Design a protein around this ligand. Structure first.
Ligand SMILES: O=C(Nc1ccc(F)c(Cl)c1)[C@H]1CCCC[C@H]1C(=O)O
Length: 133
């Protein structure tokens, strides 16, 4: 029942500062433009201890499955090969990605009827807001 409030199908309704976040991450121009246009569906499900997060969009479809606290390999939508660890901290899913001596942290939280995603790469934060589909 750990992530019950996250489970479901969510649609992107707002994005702020995503281009700047992607710049800081090292995403090149053409990927930034196309990825920044995407309006993904996020699908979160749980089966036992395994959490699955899918993103479906016109740009890329991605899927990760993981157990909290247990590192895994992830190929991101922008084609980074990262080492990821996701934990629950005070009801917030905290996802850290490590690659090439760099790190970014993505937090996913339930706030009212929204799922709020905050992405940080050094000093730069982007906020992406999802509602139920
Ligand atoms: O955006 C994401 N994934 C994702 C997948 C497939 C795509 F095509 C595009 Cl563009 C993005 C997540 C990962 C990076 C930070 C924001 C997160 C989110 O909003 O759900």
């Amino acid at each position: 029942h750990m992530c019950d409030a996250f489970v479901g199908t969510w649609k992107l309704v707002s994005s702020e500062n995503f281009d700047d976040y992607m710049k800081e991450v090292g995403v090149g121009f053409a990927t930034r433009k196309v990825a920044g246009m995407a309006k993904p569906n996020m699908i979160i499900s749980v089966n036992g201890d395994v959490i699955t997060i899918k993103s479906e969009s016109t740009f890329k479809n991605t899927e990760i499955s993981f157990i909290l606290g247990q590192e895994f390999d992830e190929v991101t939508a922008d084609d980074r090969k990262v080492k990821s660890t996701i934990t629950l901290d005070g009801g917030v899913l905290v996802h850290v990605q490590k690659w090439d001596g760099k790190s970014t942290t993505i937090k996913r939280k339930r706030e009212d009827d929204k799922l709020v995603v905050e992405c940080v790469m050094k000093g730069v934060t982007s906020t992406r807001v999802y509602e139920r589909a």
